[PDB]
Design a protein around this ligand. Structure first.
Ligand SMILES: *[C@@H]1O[C@H](CO)[C@@H](O)[C@H](O)[C@H]1NC(C)=O
Lengths: 49, 49
């Protein structure tokens, strides 16, 4: 039930272990343009929310 | 620049730590993952600068 562009549902996630590795086995990831934060280092840099 | 100052670049990907007072001028491809990138610079192979 993916939402549309006009109305997006925000999810506040403040208690879990952010393992950004299982996402690699979700799709070939055609569009993976990332910003200043390095994709290869995400486990070391902890985020407030 | 009002449009963009695409004259400065900086490295995000390095194999290991950088000892003081040395340089890493290198236009290579960062071979992350198992796929042996051969200059394709596709998925999991991103331009370090
Ligand atoms: C520095 O030397 C190592 C080992 O010889 C080599 O792998 C690396 O590419 C070199 N880097 C530069 C910037 O010369």
């Amino acid at each position: 039930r993916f939402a549309s562009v006009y109305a997006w549902n925000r999810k506040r996630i403040s208690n879990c272990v952010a393992d950004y590795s299982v996402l690699y086995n979700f799709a070939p990831f055609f569009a993976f343009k990332c910003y200043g934060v390095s994709p290869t280092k995400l486990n070391d840099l902890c985020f407030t929310n | 620049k009002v449009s963009g100052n695409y004259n400065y670049l900086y490295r995000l990907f390095r194999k290991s730590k950088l000892k003081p007072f040395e340089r890493d001028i290198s236009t290579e491809i960062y071979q992350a993952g198992n796929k042996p990138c051969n200059g394709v610079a596709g998925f999991n192979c991103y331009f370090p600068l």
